[PDB]
Curated annotation (Swiss-Prot), chains A, B, C, D, E, F:
PTM description: Phosphorylated, predominantly on serine residues. Phosphorylation by CK1 appears to occur on residues distinct from the residue phosphorylated by other kinases. Hallmark lesions of neurodegenerative synucleinopathies contain alpha-synuclein that is modified by nitration of tyrosine residues and possibly by dityrosine cross-linking to generated stable oligomers.
UniProt lineage: Eukaryota, Metazoa, Chordata, Craniata, Vertebrata
Region (4 X 11 AA tandem repeats of [EGS]-K-T-K-[EQ]-[GQ]-V-X(4)): 1-32
Name of this protein: Alpha-synuclein
Chain positions of Sequence repeats: 7-21, 22-32
Interval of the full protein contained in this chain: 36 to 97 of 140
Species name: Homo sapiens (Human)
Effect of residue 15 to Q: In PARK1; no effect on protein structure; no effect on phosphorylation of the protein; no effect on membrane- and lipid-binding; increases oligomerization; increases fibril formation; increases secretion of the protein; impairs copper-binding
């Protein structure tokens, strides 16, 4: 297969992931896995052959 | 197969994921998996061959 | 396979991952896995052959 | 007197004076006097106190 | 008197005077006088006290 | 009097005077007088006290 990506960008501004929290008690922030950010972002064949990407989070409060 | 992507963008602004929380008690933020953000974003064949992407979150409050 | 990426960017500004927390008690920030940020970001074949990327976080409060 | 000029210009293109001539015999081009060209052009008190600006052209064909 | 000029220009292109002639016999080009060209062009009190600016051109063909 | 000029220019391109001639017989180009070219061009009190600026051109063809 052939994958061609072509961009001609002028004055491009990108914000990938933003998180804001205020006046809380507990804070659990998890940003992971396969996060691709850019002006020209390409993500091909992220998982191949019985792969795994968890990006999980546990929370037990006793 | 052939996949051609062509963009001619001028003054392009992108916000991928935003989260705002105020005056809470517990905060559990999970951003993961396959997040692609850009001015020209391409995601081809994210999962192939019995793959897995969880991006899960557990919450037990006892 | 052939993957061609071509960009002609002028005055491009990218913010990958941002986290803001204020007036909290506990702070758990986890940024990992496969985070790709740029003006031209490419991520090909992140996981191959029964691989694993956890990017997990545990939280037990007793 | 008070003269205030304020401009906030973005991507401004100005062409002051253009002259095109083709397949002629005689060519007499005269550009003078008080020609002001710009993105923010101000011309105050061009002539004061019995002044003179001719910007003339003569043509005698015998 | 007070004359205030303020400009905030971004990507400004200015062409003051242009002259094009093709396939002619005689060519007389005269550009003079008070020609002001710029991105912020100011011309104050060009002529004062019985001054003179000719910017003339003669043409006699016998 | 007070004359204040303030400019904040980014990527500014200026062409003052251009002349193009092709396939002619006689060529008389005269650029003079008070020609001011720039990104911030100011011309104050060009002529004062019975001054003179000719910027003339004669052409006799016998």
């Amino acid at each position: 297969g052939v994958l061609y990506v072509g961009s001609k960008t002028k004055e491009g501004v990108v914000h990938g992931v933003a998180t804001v929290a205020e006046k809380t008690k507990e804070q659990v922030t998890n940003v992971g896995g396969a996060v691709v950010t850019g002006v020209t972002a390409v993500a091909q064949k992220t998982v191949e052959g019985a792969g795994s990407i968890a990006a999980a989070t546990g929370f037990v409060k006793k």
